[PDB]
C-alpha cells in the first residue's frame, strides 16, 4: 500500500467501456431511486403503503449490491487490458473514478437517511432496519477499498 507508486482491438476495448458506462448510469439511477424512497418513508405514510415501500426499497438495495459486484469486475478487467496502453488506462481509470464517486454518493445518501430516521422516531422492527443499513455501509466501505487496490 504505497500511495507514491469488435474485431479491431480499440473498438473491442471501448465496447467494454461503453458497457461499463451504461451500468454506471444504471447504478446512478438505482441510487437515485433509493434516495427517493428514503424521502417517501420520511413522510408519514399509512401502515399499508409503508410495507410496499419497504419491499421496493429492499429490491433496489439488492439490485445495487449486484450491480456493484458487476461494475467492480468489469472495471478491474478494463484496467488489466490497459496495463500496456496509455489511452486504454485513461479510459478505465475514468470509469473507476466515476464508480467511486457514485459509491460515495450512495454512502452519503444512506448516512443522511440513518440520521434522519432517529431524529424522526424519538416496535423492534426499526432495529432490523438499522442492522440492514449498517450491513450496506460496511459493504460500500469494503467495495470502496477493493476499487482502490491496484490491478496487476
Amino acid at each position: 500500500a504505497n500511495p507514491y507508486e469488435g474485431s479491431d482491438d480499440f473498438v473491442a476495448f471501448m465496447n467494454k467501456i461503453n458497457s461499463i458506462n451504461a451500468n454506471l448510469s444504471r447504478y446512478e439511477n438505482i441510487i437515485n431511486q433509493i434516495d427517493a424512497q428514503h424521502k417517501d418513508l420520511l413522510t408519514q405514510v399509512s401502515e399499508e403503503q409503508e410495507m410496499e415501500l419497504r419491499r421496493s426499497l429492499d429490491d433496489y438495495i439488492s439490485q445495487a449490491t449486484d450491480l456493484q459486484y458487476q461494475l467492480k469486475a468489469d472495471i478491474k478487467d478494463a484496467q488489466r487490458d490497459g496495463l500496456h496502453d496509455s489511452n486504454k488506462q485513461a479510459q478505465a481509470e475514468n470509469c473507476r473514478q466515476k464508480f467511486l464517486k457514485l459509491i460515495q454518493d450512495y454512502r452519503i445518501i444512506d448516512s443522511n437517511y440513518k440520521e434522519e430516521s432517529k431524529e424522526q422516531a424519538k416496535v423492534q422492527a426499526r432495529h432490523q432496519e438499522l442492522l440492514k443499513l449498517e450491513k450496506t455501509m460496511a459493504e460500500l466501505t469494503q467495495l470502496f477499498n477493493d476499487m482502490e487496490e491496484l490491478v496487476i
Binding site: 500511495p3 507514491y4 454512502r107 452519503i108 448516512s111 443522511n112
Partner: protein
C-alpha cells in the same frame, strides 16, 4: 522513485518502533499503522502561514501518522512524531480523528495546509504531490470512518475525495 522508496523505509521504521510491540507499561496491543507523511513545522508560527522572513532554525522536521485502535477500526488517531538518530520515532502528540473539523489548502504556499482539531495547525509537506496524497488519505479515512461525513473543506478539488458540490453539502459536518 525516491518518494516511494522513502515511504517504504519510513513505514517499516514507524511500524517497527511504534506500531508492532505491546504497550510499554500497559501491555495493550499496538495501534494498527495506516499511513504517514513527512511535514515541516515552524516552531514560531505553528498555527498560521509563516512569513518568508522566518528564520531557518524555526523549521522542524516532523511526521504525521494515522493509526487505528487495535480492537476498533472505527477509532482513528493522528500522531505527530519526530525522528531519532537511530531510525526510530518518538510520538509527541496524538489526536482523535473525531477532532478534525476543518481542512484547508493554502492557496499561496503549494505545500501548505491547515488542520483544525484541538486548534488550528499549519504544516507543510515536502512537495505539492505529498500534500495531495496525504490529505486524500486523511479525508478518505474520515469519510469511511464516520460513515458518510466529512469535515469542512476549504479550497480543495472535491473530486480528489470522490465528491461533488452537493454530495459535499450533504456530507459536511456543519450540516
Amino acid at each position: 522513485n525516491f518518494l516511494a522508496e522513502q515511504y517504504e523505509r519510513d513505514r517499516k521504521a514507524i511500524i517497527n518502533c511504534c506500531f508492532s510491540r505491546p504497550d510499554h507499561k500497559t501491555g495493550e496491543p499496538p495501534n494498527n499503522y495506516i499511513t504517514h507523511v513527512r511535514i515541516i513545522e515552524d516552531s514560531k508560527f505553528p498555527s498560521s502561514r509563516p512569513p518568508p522572513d522566518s528564520k531557518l532554525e524555526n523549521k522542524k522536521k516532523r511526521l504525521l501518522i494515522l493509526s487505528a485502535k487495535p480492537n476498533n477500526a472505527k477509532l482513528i488517531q493522528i500522531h505527530k512524531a519526530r525522528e531519532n538518530s537511530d531510525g526510530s520515532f518518538q510520538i509527541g502528540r496524538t489526536w482523535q480523528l473525531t477532532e478534525l473539523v476543518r481542512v484547508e489548502k493554502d492557496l499561496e504556499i503549494s505545500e501548505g495546509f491547515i488542520l483544525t482539531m484541538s486548534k488550528k495547525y499549519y504544516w507543510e509537506t515536502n512537495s505539492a504531490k505529498e500534500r495531495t496524497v496525504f490529505i486524500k488519505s486523511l479525508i478518505t479515512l474520515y469519510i469511511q470512518t464516520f460513515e458518510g461525513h466529512v469535515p469542512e473543506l476549504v479550497n480543495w478539488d472535491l473530486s480528489l475525495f470522490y465528491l461533488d458540490e452537493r454530495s459535499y453539502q450533504r456530507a459536511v459536518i456543519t450540516n
